[PDB]
Structures are given as C-alpha cells and as structure tokens.
C-alpha cells in the first residue's frame, strides 16, 4: 500500500518516459511497465528491451546538478494497449494530450482490478474532465485522476532507450478531480519532483491546473501563422524558426495579436466553465523563462491582465524579442513528411495543437462562448491543409490528415462538466 | 561662371570628402582644395599629398553600380584655416555640424573676394541660420548657404587618402536661405548627386531641410542610454552595440520611449520656429532603411503622427527589432580613449550629438519651449561625464570634455531667426 512501491504502467515511451522511469525507480522499488505504439521507433525499442530491459538517462547542463548518469530496468514492455492488464495500480499517460481519448478507449479497464490512479503528465484544458467521464463509464469512479500542467523537464533522445535531460521546470501545477491538496498520490508526485527542486502547486480542480499548459497559449499563434503554415506545407522552401521574427520565423505584430487574442478567448471559456483566467505574461516570465526587467518591466508583468490590448501586445512582442537574445532561436519549424508507405503526415507541431484547440473550440460553441482568434487560427489551418491534400492527393495522405475525434471529446467534456454544475 | 567649374574648397578630409571630391571632378573641371585640422590623420595626409596629390575611391556592393575605382587630384591642401584664402568660390563644410561655428570663425572672409556659396554637407537643425548670421556679419550676405539633410553616402577608409563607398542614399533634402527651388548651385548639387541616382528634394527654408537629419533623432536616445553611457565611460567592460537590444545594446522600451519623446520635443521646437514636424517613422522607413510591412505596417507608417504615444513606441520598437534581422548589428559603441598626450577624449558619438542637442535645448529655453526628453538625456549624459572626469581627474581630460560653445551658437541662431520673423 506504500505509494512509492505501486506497480506503475507508463503509456508512451517518449524521452519524457525515460526521465520519469528513472525518477520513479530512484524514489522507490516499484514494478515498472512501458507501452509504446508499434511505430518504427516503438518496434525498435521493443526488440532492444527484449534483450536488455534497461533505459539510460544523462543529465546535462543545468540538469547535471540533480540528474547524472542513471539506468532503470523495465519489468514489462507492451505495444498493444489490449495487453495493459494485470495488477497495475498507476497508469501514467506520457502520450500527448490529444491522444488520451484514443488511448483510454483501448484500455481493458476490467482487467485492471487494482487501479488507483491515472496521471495526465502533459495535460490540456479539459483532459481531466474527459478522463473522468471515461473512467466513470467503466465503473472506475474511485480512481484518482491527476492533471499536470506540463511535463517537468526538457528531455530528448541521443538511441530510443537513451535520453538526455537539459533542464527541469521551476514549478508544475497539478490537481485531482476532488480539489484535494495532498492525497497520497499528490504527495508521491511532489516527492518525485522534489528530487529536482521542482515546485508543485495544488489547484482547486483539474481545469484550474490545466489552464497553466503553456503550449495551448503559445503554439497555435506561432505554429498557425500564415508564414509558418507555408513552411510546413511546402517542404522545399527555406526553413523557418518557430520563435524568430519575420522573415526567419513568424513573430510580428499580427502573430502577437493572435497570441494576446487567443488568451482573451481562453479567459472567456475558462470563465464560462467556472475557472479564473491566468496572468499570461507573469506565467510566461515567472513560471517558465524570464527576460530582464529592462525589456519587460515588473509593472507590465504584474498588471498585464488590466493593460489595454495594444499594450499587452507590445509587452508580448518585447518578451519574444528578448527571449531570442533555453535555446528558442534553435527551434526549427518541421514540415510535412512521408512515412515508409509514402503517406504524408503532419508533424506533432501543429497537429497536436490543432486537435487540442479544435476540441476547446467545439466545447465553446456548445457552451455559447465565441473564440474569434481560435476560430481564425483554425480556419487558416484548415484552408492550408485542404490545399495541401489537393496538391498531393487525398489517397496519398495518412488518415491523421483527414479526420479527428475532437467532436466526441468535446461532447464528453461538456457532459462531465454539466454533471457537476 | 559655369557652376561646375568653380574653384571649390572642401573643409574636412573625412571619407565623405574623398567621395565628394571624386563626384565634383567627374561632373566638371574645377580647381579642388582640401583642408583638415593638424591631427595625426591630417598630418599624415598632408605629407602624402605633398608627394602625390591624388585621392582614391572604390565603390563596393550596391555602390559598385555607379561608383567604380576612381582617382582625383587635389590642387591645394591646407591645415590652417587662416590659409583658406584666394579665388575660392565654393566652400563645402564636410566637418560635422557641431564644428561649423569654430571653423567659420577662423576663415578670413576678406581674403575670399569671389565667394558665392557655402554648402553644409551634413547639416543640423539651426546650422544654416547660424551660418547666415556669421556670413552676414562678415559682409557676405550675398553668399548662398545650402544645408543638406545628411551626407549622401556610406563612405569609410580602407589609408587616409583611400576610401570605399558601400552605398548611396535614396534622397537628400536641401535648401538655401531664400527657399529657392533651383538656383544654379542647387542645380549643380542635383547634377552631382544624380550621378548616383540620389533624389534631391528642395525645401522652403534651411530648417525645413535640416529637420530631416536622421542622426538628431536616432543617436541621442541610443547613445545616451544609461547602458550605453556606462560602456562609453568604462572602457574595460564588454562592448555594447548601438542598435542591439538589451543586454547587448540599448534598445528596450525605455530607450524607444526616449526616441518617441525626443521627436515630440523637436516638433515643439520646430513648430515654434515656424516649421512643420516630420513623420519620423515614414522618414526612417521610406527615406532611409525599410523593413517589411509584416513587421511595420504601412498603416503605422502613414498614420504614425496621429498614433497614441504607446503605439508610436510599439511601432518604433518593432522597426528597430526588424532592422537587426546596411549592417546595424555591426555598429559597436565606442569608448573614451586617450590621445598621444594621454588626455582622455570622447568619441564622435555621442560628443557631436550632445553638442547638437545642447545647442537646440538652449535655443528652446530662449524661446520658451520645453523639451523634457532632450533635457533628461542631457542631464544623464552630464552626470555620467562628471563622474568620469572625477575618476580620471580633470587635468587628464582633453578640453573638449570641459566646455563647449553651444551657448553662443544658440544665441546666434535665435538672433538670426528673430531678424526674419
């Protein structure tokens, strides 16, 4: 019953999962399982682990202070979610948030009789309400659902069983569905993260933690800018950088206006759901990556939500200019690509961000709130995407380009939310 | 009497003077004289020319289109202004504008019986009113005084008799004291500059051309920023770049606010003198160095003077950010330096800019107009300068650090201006 010895199944074998597995193994003696879909990467890891079931992690730079060379044994590896069965008591979703639904629908909940908690490692707004709904339908209402605002480190590959961590986050916001402050699981998570001096801040409900997911605010305006969509869908033109100013990347007044406007839209939606908006600029500067006060004053930070729109935008433009002088300058914009079957794919940025934002947009329309900036970003993306599918032909596109389950997710979120209000 | 054959004495042998000498020699057969003070540079040029009296110019890059390799003979070189005598009919002041007074006071006007024009090559606001006053006192009221808004090229050394020109200006504003549109001299200047596709725009009076001197607007806020003054007066600390953002140079919201504010101040003063203010952002973008409209919109440019202060500043910050992505990124901030006698000197930036701005500030106070941004920039400079003189000791400072003739210049400008109004 000691929470740091619970058998723990990690779903998704991204670099974050290696760091996480090391962090659990170092805080206790727990059986560790791992899942990854049967992609090329997953298959390669599947073979590796069948021979020597150990992952490797190297702390570098800042992270070297609390993460050195480590090794962690995996007791069970699976590549079919129908095999996610047995005595597992903790599931950790390391997959991106727009895949929670597809993943949770494949888990055979009846074959997890001792399940106590499901942890949403890089949550999105509404993720926990949705997971609650799915669990409640499977008779797992007892299970504790914890949303974290983001993954807590910058981790990357070096192959698939080897990662390096550059840096750890300042703080993470988290909550379970009951607004507890310190359940056993929450205390365990705090203990895990304390090993790297990461602050944990409990929130009153799942949405009140998820509202602190930085990527919902920042990716869509940058990733869905006309000039970024053009670089994405025309793979031969010169590379763009996600955080650079025009003409090398998207940052400019119009894109900053979309950033400020999208944050306005989330405030509308969050408020409708009974949740307070964040102070975007304080969040960015003080919870994530600071810039000197000679560029972004403390006055701008503390008073941001009461500043006029144009002054909000000025402050944000200055912030992103200052950030370029973590290595934002290095983030390239990824393009469409073909897989082994020569089917075209979108990369994770913006495919994840589009799905997360489309789910919230559909939710908003159900609740009679308008999000004009979200709507303009998604209209722009959809027209670019249609044009790309016609260039290459729909038959030559992977089905991820042709549909999504955002509609059902939004309906499930609304259903859960309305059942508590 | 043909104006392109007039004997022409160029005062100041900076790189601009070499380009200018080539431009005159190529547009006519005129006797050419040259002056430079007996600095180290001037002495070295003085010896060189006594052996082979020819200067050399190389057009490079953009300028290669209308400036190739050229050579020009100097018929007379002097290093004492008391020797500025004889049949010279045109004087061209290639020296910086804060030296006009000292220079003109040394010219023996009675020994220039055929003087017809004095051309202020890189004028400042008030330069032509001041020169008028000095000429009028010497009985040279007949002489034509022409102010140009700036020097018309980016020219530099490679030694002292050899220059290269990177680029030529789009347009130059000019005027004589009578608001003519096309006197013979003005037509000659247009012909000279046309050789490089430079536009010339006649103005209704000298001040109505001088108001287009970019350096009056741009240097003081950048050069006199706290962080730039610190780099100037502490020569051992890491170099700063004049146009980069903090912490590598001064650009930040406070400095941009000084830029917008100083332009407000000049409008007050210019208006008081009967002259319309310029549109600063249109001037910068369209008459000097453009940035894409995705950064600075045409709306911001065309409407700048009616925009609210904060939006003016936003637009200016964006402009200077876009400029960094001509090689602004390369302009280093120069520091105090010792001469052969181990006396400390200020470099031309900001020493020239401080003198030009102090003259206008004293003028403004005489005319009951307040310039709070100018005043704050000069107070800041003066305190930094005092602190530096106390560190090194006043005995170890060149006298340029300890006084100026800005007071008399301002009085002379006011006197001339009042005598026409």
Curated annotation (Swiss-Prot), chains A, B:
The record's comment on protein family reads: Belongs to the staphylopine dehydrogenase family.
Q: What is this protein called?
A: Yersinopine synthase
Q: Which InterPro entries does the UniProt entry name for this protein?
A: NAD(P)-bd_dom_sf, Opine_metallophore_DH
The UniProt keyword set, sorted, is: NADP, Oxidoreductase
Group of enzyme by EC? oxidoreductase
Give the species this sequence originates from.
Yersinia pestis
Q: Which reaction does it catalyse?
A: yersinopine + NADP(+) + H2O = (2S)-2-amino-4-{[(1S)-1-carboxy-2-(1H-imidazol-4-yl)ethyl]amino}butanoate + pyruvate + NADPH + H(+)
User: EC number(s) of the enzyme?
Assistant: 1.5.1.-
Q: Which GO terms describe its molecular function?
A: oxidoreductase activity
Q: What does this protein do?
A: Catalyzes the NADPH-dependent reductive condensation of pyruvate to the intermediate formed by the adjacently encoded enzyme y2836, namely (2S)-2-amino-4-{[(1S)-1-carboxy-2-(1H-imidazol-4-yl)ethyl]amino}butanoate, leading to the production of yersinopine. This is the last step in the biosynthesis of the metallophore yersinopine, which is involved in metal acquisition and thus enables bacterial growth inside the host, where metal access is limited. Therefore, this enzyme probably contributes to Yersinia virulence.
Q: Which Pfam families match?
A: Staph_opine_DH
User: Where, by residue number, does NADP(+) bind?
Assistant: 13-16, 36-41, 155
Catalytic residues at 219 (proton donor/acceptor)
State whether it acts alone or in a complex, and with which partners, per the record.
Homodimer.
């Amino acid at each position: 019953h000691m929470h740091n010895t619970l058998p723990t199944l990690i779903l998704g074998a991204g670099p974050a999962a290696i760091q996480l597995a090391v962090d659990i193994s170092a805080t206790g003696d727990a059986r560790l399982g791992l899942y990854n879909r049967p992609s090329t990467k997953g298959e390669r890891l599947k073979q590796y682990l069948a021979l020597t079931p150990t992952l490797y992690l190297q702390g570098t730079g800042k992270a070297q202070a609390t993460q050195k060379e480590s090794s962690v044994t995996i007791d069970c590896y699976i590549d079919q979610l129908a095999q996610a069965v047995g005595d597992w008591q903790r599931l950790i979703l390391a997959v991106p948030a727009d895949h929670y639904y597809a993943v949770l629908q494949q888990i055979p909940w009846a074959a997890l009789p001792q399940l106590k908690s499901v942890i949403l490692l890089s949550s999105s707004m509404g993720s926990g309400l949705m997971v609650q709904n799915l669990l409640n339908a499977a008779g797992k209402r007892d299970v504790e659902v914890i949303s974290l605002s983001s993954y807590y480190a910058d981790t990357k590959y070096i192959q698939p069983y080897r990662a390096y961590t550059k840096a750890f986050k300042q703080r993470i916001y988290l909550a379970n569905q009951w607004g507890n402050a310190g359940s056993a699981e929450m205390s365990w998570l705090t203990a895990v993260l304390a090993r790297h001096h990461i602050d944990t801040l409990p929130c009153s409900n799942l949405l009140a933690a998820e509202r602190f997911s930085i990527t919902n605010y920042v990716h869509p305006p940058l990733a869905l800018a006309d000039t970024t969509l053009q670089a994405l869908f025309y793979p031969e033109q010169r590379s763009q950088y996600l955080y650079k100013t025009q003409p090398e990347g998207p940052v400019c007044p119009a894109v900053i206006a979309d950033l400020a406007g999208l944050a306005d839209d989330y405030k509308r939606l969050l408020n409708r759901l009974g949740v307070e908006e964040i102070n975007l600029l304080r969040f960015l500067n003080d919870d994530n990556y600071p810039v000197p006060a000679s560029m972004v004053s403390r006055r701008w930070i503390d008073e941001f939500p009461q500043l006029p729109p144009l002054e909000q935008q000025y402050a944000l433009f200055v912030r992103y200019t200052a950030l370029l002088v973590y290595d934002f300058s290095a983030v390239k914009v990824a393009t469409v690509y073909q897989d082994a079957n020569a089917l075209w794919h979108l990369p994770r940025v913006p495919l994840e961000d589009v799905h997360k934002l489309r789910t919230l947009l559909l939710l908003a329309g159900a609740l009679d709130v308008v999000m004009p900036t979200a709507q303009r970003l998604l209209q722009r993306f959809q027209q670019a995407l249609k044009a790309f599918i016609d260039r290459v032909g729909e038959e030559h596109c992977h089905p991820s380009l042709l549909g999504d389950d955002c509609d059902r997710q939004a309906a499930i979120i609304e259903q859960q939310w309305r059942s508590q209000t």
